Write a protein that binds this DNA or RNA. Sequence first.
RNA 1: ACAU
DNA 2: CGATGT
Length: 136
Amino acid sequence: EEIIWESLSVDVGSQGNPGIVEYKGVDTKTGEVLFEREPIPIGTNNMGEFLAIVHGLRYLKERNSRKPIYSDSQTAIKWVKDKKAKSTLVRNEETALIWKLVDEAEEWLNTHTYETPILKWQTDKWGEIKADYGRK
RNA sequence: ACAU
DNA sequence: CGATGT
Ligand SMILES: [K+]
Ligand SMILES: [K+]
Ligand SMILES: [K+]
Ligand SMILES: [Mn+2]
Ligand SMILES: [Mn+2]
Ligand SMILES: [Mn+2]
Ligand SMILES: [Mn+2]
Ligand SMILES: [Mn+2]
């Protein structure tokens, strides 16, 4: 309904899907970039969206912030809720890095707690999420 | 269909 | 146009 401006917004960016994956988190209110992940040579949009949320959870917990996280990815929000990233990406030598990061993110979710609300950014009403890469 |  | 997902 109304945007919660006191929040963290996260998003993936990619070159190809599967392709080079990165992500970032921004202050929804100002657009200040708060974190950015070094590009990963092969991954999927959804793996990156998932990593971005989990990193946001870890970022906010470390700073004792109760702000919610916005994501535009229905898939990744569900994967975080389930603590399980149900990616179809083949596990092979060239996808090993992204899969290691995904497996490590799931592992962190399974050994830590948080109350952070993870909210759907309503692109149809509000435009692109503030962490978007501007590539579409 | 919806979400990327 | 095509790929990732529920
Ligand atoms: K979008
Ligand atoms: K984009
Ligand atoms: K589809
Ligand atoms: Mn997105
Ligand atoms: Mn796993
Ligand atoms: Mn985007
Ligand atoms: Mn376009
Ligand atoms: Mn397009």
